[PDB]
Write a protein that binds this ligand. Sequence first.
Ligand SMILES: O=C(O)[C@@H]1O[C@@H](O[C@H]2[C@H](O)[C@H](O)[C@H](O)O[C@H]2C(=O)O)[C@@H](O)[C@@H](O)[C@@H]1O
Length: 226
Amino acid sequence: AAAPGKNFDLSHWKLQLPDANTTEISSANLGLGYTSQYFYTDTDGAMTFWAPTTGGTTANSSYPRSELREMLDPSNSKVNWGWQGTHTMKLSGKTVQLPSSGKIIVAQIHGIMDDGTNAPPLVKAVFQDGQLDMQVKQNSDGTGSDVHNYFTGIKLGDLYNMEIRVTDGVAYVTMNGDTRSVDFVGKDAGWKNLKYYFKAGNFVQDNTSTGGSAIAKLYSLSVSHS
Ligand SMILES: O=C(O)[C@@H]1O[C@@H](O[C@H]2[C@H](O)[C@H](O)[C@H](O)O[C@H]2C(=O)O)[C@@H](O)[C@@H](O)[C@@H]1O
């Protein structure tokens, strides 16, 4: 019954919560065994993220989350990685319960300005009962639309194996050994002006009062920069 920080390497993740005040838990406190209604180890050992649709939201989102936010430097969220080189997150997990909207985001690459100011998400792994859509943003200024990458057949409760990789300004998005790519720096050179961090957890795409809540699980989670 050990807390997730004992089962996963959370030394370079902080946790963002869907409580009224959108509390954050540090890497160190995750390692010490932080657990709550929003974040816990289930009977199957999974790191489990729960968030209600009525939860608190961050300053630039309509939606609540129980979600890890990568910290290259666990003591400074303004230290983030760039477009050049290779940057890889791998995970395995499942979504157990959806809100009324039937949509959550279970993994991301998020952009950020050099000064820590918000920038657009780059990759969003959107889960629905029957499909994961690994969406890649076109433009670094947040305008335009997203490039969709549909992986159909993935159901509620099914185990997915996922990888999101950036190598030299190209995003490679993988679900169960099936990989698609989007050259994001090639769509917009402006992406070279931004930095990036991974996210993984449960970002609930429903903020309605009667929308219920969602549960997402992870069985493995690793990040590498090379
Ligand atoms: O809505 C936003 O601005 C959020 O930005 C990111 O989280 C940042 C936010 O300021 C949050 O309250 C806390 O201070 O962490 C910040 C960070 O880690 O950069 C982003 O991860 C997401 O929560 C949302 O887009």
